[PDB]
């Protein structure tokens, strides 16, 4: 599923991401834009043999099981395929664990490089939330 911008904002808000660990909703929308283009089905192989999955490009080395990643810990206790669903519940739950890991949203490279320090509120402008 490719979410609309405000559609994804509303889903993330309903799932409790707005201000989660102090990160306003626009941060999460911005991260998803640059990680996945709001596409739940996005996958990308990493150089180390892991793969990133879903709207927030969650990695198979620590977070989810994809059956093919060396050193996998599956800390979210979910198959990586669950992170590709049109229902973002599993991605949100796992993202909550990731953002609580100590480095906040710096865990998402695209967030640090493209969202951090910018007017992230722009990502929710116009939405009825
Ligand atoms: Cl915001
Ligand atoms: Cl933080």
From Swiss-Prot:
CDD domains: LYZ_C. GO terms for molecular function: beta-N-acetylglucosaminidase activity; identical protein binding; lysozyme activity. Pfam families: Lys. This is Lysozyme C. Residues 1-129 form the C-type lysozyme domain. Belongs to the glycosyl hydrolase 22 family. It comes from Gallus gallus (Chicken). Keywords: Allergen, Antimicrobial, Bacteriolytic enzyme, Disulfide bond, Glycosidase, Hydrolase, Secreted, Signal.
